[PDB]
């Protein structure tokens, strides 16, 4: 009874100093306090832990909670605790082992006196506030702290060297603050029990200090988004329990450490956006690897065959390097490949036929390589695909039939290859298709009517092919269509007269075909049309006056069979290049007509 009374009163007093607009603490408003929401007790009925995570509470830090004599854990994670921390707020909190103030609205400085007032803490988190000024050097006095998280504040100055005296630390998270440009303090090498070191976005310069080789229990080393220089040190390779190395967006130079191949525990490795040279290490035995990102470097040589030993690999992004050679033929057969982006390299030979062997591949991005041969019929059945970009390669043959109708495919980009064949009617199944980009190929036959059923289409880009027959009337009711480019084909017939469905059409390019009839008057009523190119066709009749409504970046009606007068808005000689090659046309230059 005694302890239930005490606890209930202190808890109610604390609650009175907060605003609770979500009624999260209604249970504190019959029942023993040991069963109130967020409240845990020990066997003698004393409150030991108060967890008010995500309760939408507003107001100053409720330091009255510290008057509970057995309180060991306090979490106010993700509320609206506001104002600043004073020295006084923590005077009575000296029994705490765990304190979580992350994701609140706190401002101002960390009190210098915090370690003195909270000497028993093992876990301190104040991540995601607006804390400013420096991390106090007194933080070097904590005798028991295991985890420190100050990530995502406006803390400035530099990371204090005295943190190296907190040799009980297992996690140190200081990422995304406003520190001055400085080196990683060498003294952090004394934190020999560290498992997590997260100093992303900390304005770090210079090398990773050699002392950090003493951090032999590292599991996650994350130094992303800094300006670190020199080699990625080869001691990361001998970490027996390393799972994650994140070093992207730095200025690392030299080569990937040669013996990376033996890091059997490694799950994720990202050293993208650096200045790495040399080759991808070979004899890979990266048994646990899930993600390998090495994009935007100056890597050369091949993707080693031994990558296929990584039977859990799901993400491989190597784009923007100078990699060469043929891909390992078995790539993807034995891995749940999800995201593959090898663009802007010099790869050659065929696309591995089972890149989607496990049925998980979503992105297949191979732009700007010299891949040759055909797309495997396998890929025609890769139903998980959303984003395919195969442009600017040396691919040939007919596209696999089912590829056109994949149910989740959003971007299909095949441009600048030598693909042949007609677009099949199975394109009707591509319900999610947004962008069809197939220019600069040898596709033949007629544009199938079913492309008009794909209501989401925003782009049909088919220039420089061998398309013939008519533009299907169906395209004219694609409400979201932004860009229609079918220039340099063999299309015939007319443009449909009813075009009000084209409310989003920004570009209409049908130059260099065999199109006939009149330019329909409704071209000029399209609300966002900025590009119109109908040149090099057999359009006849008069240029509609409604074109004068539009603000056209490009207007080109040259090399047709058009007649009558040029609309008066375009009568100046600066637009003359728009209308050349229409022998029947003239300009009304002050009275008579000039050809």
């Amino acid at each position: 009874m005694g302890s239930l009374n005490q606890d209930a009163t202190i808890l109610r007093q604390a609650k009175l100093g907060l605003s609770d607009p979500a009624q999260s603490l209604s249970s504190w408003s019959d029942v023993t306090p040991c069963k109130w929401l967020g409240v845990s007790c020990d066997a003698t009925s004393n409150v030991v832990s108060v967890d008010l995570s995500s309760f939408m509470l507003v107001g100053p830090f409720p330091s009255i909670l510290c008057h509970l004599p057995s309180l060991h854990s306090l979490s106010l994670y993700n509320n609206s605790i506001n104002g600043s921390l004073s020295a006084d707020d923590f005077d009575t909190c000296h029994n705490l082992i765990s304190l979580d103030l992350s994701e609140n609205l706190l401002v101002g400085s960390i009190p210098k006196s915090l370690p003195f007032n909270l000497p028993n803490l093992k876990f301190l988190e104040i991540s995601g506030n607006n804390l400013s000024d420096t991390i106090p050097s007194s933080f070097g006095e904590f005798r028991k702290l295991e985890s420190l998280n100050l990530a995502g504040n406006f803390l400035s100055g530099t990371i204090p060297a005295s943190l190296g005296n907190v040799t009980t630390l297992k996690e140190l998270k200081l990422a995304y603050n406003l520190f001055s440009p400085s080196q990683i303090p060498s003294q952090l090498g004394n934190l020999t029990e560290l498992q997590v070191l997260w100093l992303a976005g900390c304005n770090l310069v210079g090398p990773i200090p050699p002392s950090l080789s003493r951090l032999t229990s590292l599991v996650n080393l994350d130094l992303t988004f800094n300006q670190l220089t020199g080699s990625i040190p080869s001691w990361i390779t001998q970490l027996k329990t390393v799972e994650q190395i994140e070093l992207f967006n730095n200025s690392f130079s030299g080569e990937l450490p040669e013996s990376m191949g033996n890091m059997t525990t490694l799950k994720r490795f990202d050293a993208s956006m650096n200045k790495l040279t040399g080759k991808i290490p070979d004899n890979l035995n990266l048994l646990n690897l899930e993600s390998l990102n090495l994009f935007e470097n100056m890597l050369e040589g091949p993707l080693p065959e031994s990558i296929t030993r990584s039977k859990t690999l799901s993400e491989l992004k190597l784009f923007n390097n100078r990699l060469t050679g043929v891909l390992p033929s078995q790539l993807g057969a034995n891995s749940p490949l999800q995201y593959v982006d090898l663009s802007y390299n010099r790869f050659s030979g065929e696309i591995p036929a089972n890149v989607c062997g496990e049925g998980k591949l979503e992105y297949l991005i191979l732009i700007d390589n010299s891949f040759s041969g055909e797309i495997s019929n396998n890929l025609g059945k890769c139903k998980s695909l959303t984003r395919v970009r195969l442009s600017n390669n040396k691919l040939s043959g007919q596209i696999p039939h089912g590829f056109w109708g994949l149910p989740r495919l959003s971007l299909l980009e095949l441009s600048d290859n030598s693909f042949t064949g007609s677009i099949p009617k199975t394109i009707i199944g591509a319900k999610n298709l947004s962008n069809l980009r197939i220019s600069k190929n040898r596709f033949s036959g007629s544009i199938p009517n079913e492309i008009g059923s794909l209501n989401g289409i925003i782009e049909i880009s088919g220039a420089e092919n061998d398309f013939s027959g008519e533009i299907p009337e169906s395209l004219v009711k694609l409400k979201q269509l932004s860009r229609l480019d079918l220039s340099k084909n063999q299309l015939s017939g007319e443009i449909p007269r009813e075009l009000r469905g084209w409310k989003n059409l920004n570009e209409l390019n049908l130059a260099n075909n065999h199109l006939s009839g009149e330019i329909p008057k409704e071209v000029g009523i399209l609300p966002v049309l900025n590009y119109l190119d109908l040149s090099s066709n057999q359009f006849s009749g008069e240029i509609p006056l409604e074109l004068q409504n539009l603000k056209l970046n490009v207007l080109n009606l040259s090399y047709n069979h058009l007649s009558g007068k040029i609309p008066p808005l375009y009568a100046n000689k600066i637009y003359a290049h728009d209308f050349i090659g229409n022998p029947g046309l003239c300009v009304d230059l002050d009275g008579l007509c000039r050809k």
Binding site: G152, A200, D222, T224, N249, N293, K317, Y339, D341, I365
Partner: peptide, 12 residues
């Protein structure tokens, strides 16, 4: 919020 400690999501 704060970017997680995880792989870059950049891609083409």
């Amino acid at each position: 919020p704060i970017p997680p400690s995880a792989p870059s999501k950049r891609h083409n």
